[PDB]
Amino acid sequence: LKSRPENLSFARCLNTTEAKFWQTDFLKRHTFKLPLLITSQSCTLSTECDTLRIDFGIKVLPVKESMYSCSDYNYRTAIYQKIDEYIAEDGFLTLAKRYVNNIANARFLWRNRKGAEIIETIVTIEDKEYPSFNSKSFNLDTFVEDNATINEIAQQIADTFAGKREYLNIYVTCFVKIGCAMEVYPSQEMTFDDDDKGKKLFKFEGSAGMHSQKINNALRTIDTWYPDYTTYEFPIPVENYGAARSIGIPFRPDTKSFYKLIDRMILKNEDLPIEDKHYVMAILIRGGMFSKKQE
Amino acid sequence: NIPVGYEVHHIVPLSQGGADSIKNMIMLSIEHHERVTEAHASYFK
Amino acid sequence: MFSQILIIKPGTGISPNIIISEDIFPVLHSLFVEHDKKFGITFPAYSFDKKGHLGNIIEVLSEDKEALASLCLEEHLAEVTDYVKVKKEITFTDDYVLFKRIREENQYETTARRMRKRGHTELGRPLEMHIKKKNQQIFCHAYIKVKSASTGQSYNIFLAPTDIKHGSFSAYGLL
């Protein structure tokens, strides 16, 4: 164990389905639903209904076997040992609570969150309808660990994370009221075309939808243990260098970039604070191809 | 940044074998650039 | 020159310009046209560059402390608490940089009929590329997207700081 191997690649542990939109009414949202078609295309809500519904899902796998490819067995044994130590220390409860709080506060609505008058999200685990969420009463920076249903979901997702069950399926639906004949904001696509440089929205299964990458990026916005956090006081999405495009400052440029933490954790075997353990386990949850040159 | 009302114009035209080096252009007025361009287009073409 | 401060919350998911041009600006414009309009607008984060980036902090100024108290910025804004933060601290500021509007040339076919109804010369194509001159600078400053409240349309208000420490403010707040 002197350096990272030639090949090292980790598959993700949190798969997200693509989203799709629907139109309905708040008083009859439990009965009927109408498709939200795409009309420089720009989608808009119809002139009769006044509620927008978004449905998607998450598949979760345990972290231990989530490693896809590696080149050295000693590195794999060291990684497994460190993961076992982290499991025996806390049990993945903090990251689980942060993820379920990011679900609860509905950070996946993005621009559609602003201007809404009521939001209500429903999460169902193994055909069991959990109590509803009032997502309006949730600050974007708080990470409260006191809601009973939040803890109930958090224990299950943490148990799925560590070693308890081979898989978990989560299904999320949400109704947001924005008014009548308003405008919604779906995702977009690349524009490599040399003509018609206008926006091309995301058409999923004929209706309007949002990319899975956007939902995942909204969900994994839980990093608060970055340096100079007390001077900014806002969570950032989890990334290797900690770069945040919202401001333009890399919060983990050199000393807290994931490569050096994992090198000090594995090769030097030095102990680390619990914040660094949280960041490393979150990065391993996200996955990547943290590989190395021949040296 | 580029001054307002001033553009980069190469003294030696690039279409007639000009060089893309520092010593090849001088900034000129928004009108004198057009005058030099029209005179060069009239002389050559 | 008592000043009230508002801070745009970062790392939310919406650009600060959209929050400025969506809820804050119409509210302050309505409050200004309701009141004497003497309150001024300040941006204590302005940084001109190749592109005129705006900043993240909103400041409002008044001669009278009780005028800013009656403006009740704490009142309303109960739906943007997750995007902007108001503070109940008002004090006279040592520096108060005012901003001036740089409204200019509109378009070719827009100005065509209103230039032909007085300037009957019908100059046509030549020298009208001079408009491509002026916008070349003016499309480098900070601006705000605003919908025309009266004449059912929308336009951009371009602004830049100015050294005049006193004067008469507009309906929006600019000098």
Side-chain angles (χ1 to χ4, degrees), chain A, chain B residues 1-9 11-45, chain C:
Chain A
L1 296 185
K2 331 287 144 211
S3 100
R4 285 197 312 274
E6 229 279 343
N7 295 339
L8 186 68
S9 308
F10 286 82
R12 93 197 70 139
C13 321
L14 207 73
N15 295 273
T16 326
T17 84
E18 320 275 18
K20 94 185 279 189
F21 300 153
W22 292 88
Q23 338 183 38
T24 174
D25 177 270
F26 200 54
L27 308 179
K28 306 171 267 95
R29 55 196 200 261
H30 308 319
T31 69
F32 84 112
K33 32 183 270 157
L34 315 171
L36 190 33
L37 265 284
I38 284 285
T39 82
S40 192
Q41 48 253 71
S42 322
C43 188
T44 171
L45 203 161
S46 83
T47 41
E48 290 326 293
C49 50
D50 46 322
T51 315
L52 156 75
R53 164 211 281 260
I54 306 107
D55 317 325
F56 71 106
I58 312 123
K59 185 177 231 40
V60 197
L61 325 168
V63 202
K64 190 66 137 316
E65 80 289 333
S66 149
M67 161 152 24
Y68 179 78
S69 92
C70 181
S71 168
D72 159 51
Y73 207 38
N74 308 133
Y75 209 106
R76 175 174 326 227
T77 53
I79 291 282
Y80 275 44
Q81 173 64 40
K82 301 316 260 181
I83 290 170
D84 286 316
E85 292 164 0
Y86 188 88
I87 287 162
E89 203 254 0
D90 158 80
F92 280 107
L93 200 33
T94 89
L95 303 187
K97 280 186 164 263
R98 291 218 178 174
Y99 284 142
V100 80
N101 284 22
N102 244 348
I103 273 176
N105 88 305
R107 212 175 294 249
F108 50 86
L109 279 166
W110 283 90
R111 200 172 159 168
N112 324 281
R113 192 182 147 87
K114 196 210 59 50
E117 80 99 18
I118 201 51
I119 312 182
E120 163 250 302
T121 86
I122 280 294
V123 51
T124 299
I125 310 304
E126 269 289 334
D127 53 281
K128 182 210 153 302
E129 277 257 340
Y130 281 79
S132 150
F133 284 172
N134 177 272
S135 202
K136 259 299 204 140
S137 35
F138 263 110
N139 159 244
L140 278 147
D141 308 341
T142 44
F143 274 147
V144 46
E145 54 261 42
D146 307 65
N147 173 269
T149 89
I150 273 185
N151 306 339
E152 205 170 333
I153 300 158
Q155 200 29 256
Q156 307 208 239
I157 178 65
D159 280 347
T160 311
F161 265 133
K164 291 316 150 324
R165 59 200 89 263
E166 67 276 2
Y167 83 107
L168 196 48
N169 280 327
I170 303 195
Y171 282 137
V172 202
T173 197
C174 52
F175 312 108
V176 53
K177 168 155 301 314
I178 70 174
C180 215
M182 301 295 327
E183 184 233 344
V184 297
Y185 307 88
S187 168
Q188 281 107 286
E189 265 102 333
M190 271 317 79
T191 60
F192 296 105
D193 205 356
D194 40 327
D195 39 50
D196 209 18
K197 314 292 199 140
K199 332 161 305 302
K200 301 211 156 53
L201 300 194
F202 184 52
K203 212 184 312 302
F204 169 73
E205 257 178 6
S207 34
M210 178 157 18
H211 283 208
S212 69
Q213 315 90 286
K214 183 141 278 299
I215 306 286
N216 243 345
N217 185 276
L219 274 200
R220 67 135 167 279
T221 314
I222 57 157
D223 182 26
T224 57
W225 323 282
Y226 56 98
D228 321 70
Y229 164 67
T230 70
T231 54
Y232 289 112
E233 285 108 330
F234 73 100
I236 77 146
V238 161
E239 191 66 330
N240 294 21
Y241 289 127
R245 54 174 74 258
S246 36
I247 305 312
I249 329 167
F251 290 161
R252 302 176 169 269
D254 47 57
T255 323
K256 307 290 277 196
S257 96
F258 176 70
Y259 299 84
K260 283 159 61 184
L261 285 89
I262 204 52
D263 288 341
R264 292 172 37 206
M265 179 138 161
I266 304 304
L267 307 172
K268 307 309 189 230
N269 207 2
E270 67 149 292
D271 211 272
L272 275 185
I274 196 55
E275 285 74 20
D276 308 66
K277 305 186 158 45
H278 288 331
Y279 167 78
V280 167
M281 257 37 53
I283 283 270
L284 280 197
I285 276 182
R286 172 187 77 89
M289 158 255 299
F290 333 103
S291 185
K292 182 97 191 92
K293 215 56 167 53
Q294 49 103 350
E295 278 96 343
Chain B
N1 73 100
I2 302 109
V4 190
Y6 259 67
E7 329 90 289
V8 161
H9 165 79
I11 307 114
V12 191
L14 294 201
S15 321
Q16 301 270 9
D20 194 62
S21 88
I22 275 177
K23 295 95 46 184
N24 207 35
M25 71 304 297
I26 170 178
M27 291 55 68
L28 257 77
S29 93
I30 199 88
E31 201 257 6
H32 297 335
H33 202 330
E34 309 155 350
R35 310 284 71 66
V36 172
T37 317
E38 289 324 291
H40 278 331
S42 75
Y43 180 58
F44 295 141
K45 308 107 211 151
Chain C
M1 281 305 108
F2 301 94
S3 88
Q4 197 158 4
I5 208 76
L6 326 173
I7 164 67
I8 290 300
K9 303 198 143 187
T12 285
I14 310 111
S15 148
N17 317 44
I18 309 199
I19 324 162
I20 283 157
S21 38
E22 204 30 75
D23 293 358
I24 325 172
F25 190 54
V27 160
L28 63 95
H29 178 39
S30 54
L31 285 184
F32 281 11
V33 299
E34 168 256 327
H35 260 305
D36 173 71
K37 96 206 298 203
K38 62 142 206 188
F39 320 95
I41 174 63
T42 326
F43 291 151
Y46 184 85
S47 40
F48 189 73
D49 210 83
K50 158 78 224 83
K51 176 182 105 191
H53 181 271
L54 201 31
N56 279 51
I57 302 111
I58 292 273
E59 193 166 312
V60 81
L61 325 168
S62 90
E63 293 85 289
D64 166 42
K65 178 76 134 270
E66 295 86 276
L68 268 205
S70 319
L71 249 198
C72 61
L73 270 302
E74 203 276 332
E75 286 321 296
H76 332 100
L77 315 182
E79 296 89 343
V80 289
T81 84
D82 303 358
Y83 311 106
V84 71
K85 184 50 171 91
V86 68
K87 285 186 284 328
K88 43 200 67 48
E89 301 98 75
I90 317 108
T91 173
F92 161 73
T93 167
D94 50 349
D95 166 49
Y96 26 73
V97 186
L98 306 187
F99 291 90
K100 196 92 202 256
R101 190 208 191 119
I102 317 157
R103 150 205 291 269
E104 70 146 348
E105 198 271 320
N106 205 281
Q107 240 172 42
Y108 201 48
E109 224 43 64
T110 284
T111 53
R113 64 221 171 270
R114 252 292 282 129
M115 200 218 58
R116 88 169 57 246
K117 285 331 272 181
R118 179 219 37 88
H120 311 354
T121 65
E122 318 307 308
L123 63 104
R125 187 241 161 246
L127 206 51
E128 276 319 297
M129 311 315 88
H130 84 274
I131 81 179
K132 196 136 66 167
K133 297 186 210 344
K134 41 203 51 180
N135 321 133
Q136 152 275 349
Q137 163 64 310
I138 309 300
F139 291 159
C140 276
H141 312 80
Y143 56 92
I144 276 176
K145 192 40 84 185
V146 53
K147 324 289 183 315
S148 316
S150 52
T151 88
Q153 181 31 271
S154 74
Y155 55 91
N156 248 346
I157 293 184
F158 288 75
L159 73 151
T162 168
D163 312 278
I164 326 171
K165 307 304 293 319
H166 296 320
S168 68
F169 291 130
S170 70
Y172 305 117
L174 300 183
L175 181 55

